Amino acid sequence: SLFELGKMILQETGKNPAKSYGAYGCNCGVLGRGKPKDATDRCCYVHKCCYKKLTGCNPKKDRYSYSWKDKTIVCGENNPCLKELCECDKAVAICLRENLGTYNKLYRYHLKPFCKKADDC
Amino acid sequence: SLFELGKMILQETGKNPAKSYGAYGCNCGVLGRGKPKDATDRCCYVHKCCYKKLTGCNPKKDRYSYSWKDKTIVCGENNPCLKELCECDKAVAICLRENLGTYNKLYRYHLKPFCKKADDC
Numbered sequence: 264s265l266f267e268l269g270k271m272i273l274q275e276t277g278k279n280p281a282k283s284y285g286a287y288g289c290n291c292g293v294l295g296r297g298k299p300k301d302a303t304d305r306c307c308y309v310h311k312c313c314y315k316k317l318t319g320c321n322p323k324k325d326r327y328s329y330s331w332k333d334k335t336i337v338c339g340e341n342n343p344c345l346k347e348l349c350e351c352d353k354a355v356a357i358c359l360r361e362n363l364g365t366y367n368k369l370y371r372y373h374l375k376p377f378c379k380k381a382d383d384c
Numbered sequence: 385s386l387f388e389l390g391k392m393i394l395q396e397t398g399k400n401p402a403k404s405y406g407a408y409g410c411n412c413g414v415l416g417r418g419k420p421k422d423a424t425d426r427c428c429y430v431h432k433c434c435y436k437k438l439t440g441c442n443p444k445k446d447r448y449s450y451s452w453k454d455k456t457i458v459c460g461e462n463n464p465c466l467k468e469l470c471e472c473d474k475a476v477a478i479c480l481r482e483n484l485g486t487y488n489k490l491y492r493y494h495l496k497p498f499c500k501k502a503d504d505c
């Protein structure tokens with residue numbers, strides 16, 4: 264669910280998830296996908312496409328189990344779809360931390376309606 | 385949809401919706417409901433309970449028709465669920481504008497794990 268995603272982003276990046284990523288670029292936060300503005304935006308683009316493949320469950324509301332061992336997100340879920348969901352969330356949290364170096368505050372509250380259309384997932 | 389909701393909030397409050405309300409208190413933004421911190425937070429609490437009473441239409445993705453006539457939000461929508469959805473969004477936009485006087489910047493991006501569980505709607 265969005266709860267576990269938010270905890271993951273806070274654990275990996277150390278940043279408030281909705282502040283730094285609630286409306287970043289054309290893909291982070293609300294209002295679907297668009298042409299990525301930068302590397303951080305592409306993390307959210309990939310993450311949204313990760314959600315679109317979850318054909319057997321529901322990413323926004325389905326809670327899953329994960330652990331924080333050796334400063335690493337570990338998805339211990341036995342259910343295959345929840346496990347696939349947890350790995351989507353873990354990937355974007357790692358991706359967002361890995362691209363903090365090119366984070367641009369000018370994209371933090373980006374006017375998404377004027378974004379160029381995105382390619383199909 | 386979030387498009388209409390965001391535009392309603394801007395027209396009523398004069399504030400940008402994601403920057404000022406994308407994460408406020410315990411109820412504004414994603415991550416569900418919680419014990420509200422103030423009157424602004426309670427607007428989003430009531431708003432989410434309003435969404436729960438809807439009759440099948442998707443509050444996030446479904447578009448509806450409304451007009452800004454004589455500085456008033458008018459829900460001309462005729463579909464019963466989309467009309468109620470429009471009325472939910474108009475209510476929170478008015479609520480946030482009515483309570484701007486106690487808008488506390490410290491509750492912006494309020495850490496959402498912080499919050500106590502909310503009462504049932």
Ligand SMILES: CCc1c(C(=O)C(N)=O)c2c(OCC(=O)O)cccc2n1Cc1ccccc1
Nearest residue numbers: 265268269280281284285290291292307310311
């Ligand atoms: C980058 C963070 C993010 C999403 C992403 O991880 C992303 N843009 O991919 C995402 C999101 O994406 C899933 C989807 O659109 O279905 C939907 C809604 C909000 C979304 N926040 C903001 C947020 C998440 C969790 C706690 C607090 C704020």
Ligand SMILES: CCc1c(C(=O)C(N)=O)c2c(OCC(=O)O)cccc2n1Cc1ccccc1
Nearest residue numbers: 286372373374375376387390391400401402403
């Ligand atoms: C689409 C929702 C939205 C914003 C978003 O949700 C978004 N683009 O992120 C946003 C906005 O940005 C959030 C922020 O700056 O706080 C600023 C101002 C208005 C904003 N409307 C309403 C709107 C946008 C474009 C045309 C007509 C109405």
Ligand SMILES: CCc1c(C(=O)C(N)=O)c2c(OCC(=O)O)cccc2n1Cc1ccccc1
Nearest residue numbers: 386390401402405406411412413414428431432
């Ligand atoms: C108060 C603003 C708000 C929501 C509310 O109005 C609120 N928390 O009640 C809400 C929201 O709530 C509906 C729900 O949780 O299903 C879900 C996701 C984002 C939400 N933004 C932020 C936003 C909305 C529209 C344009 C730009 C930013």
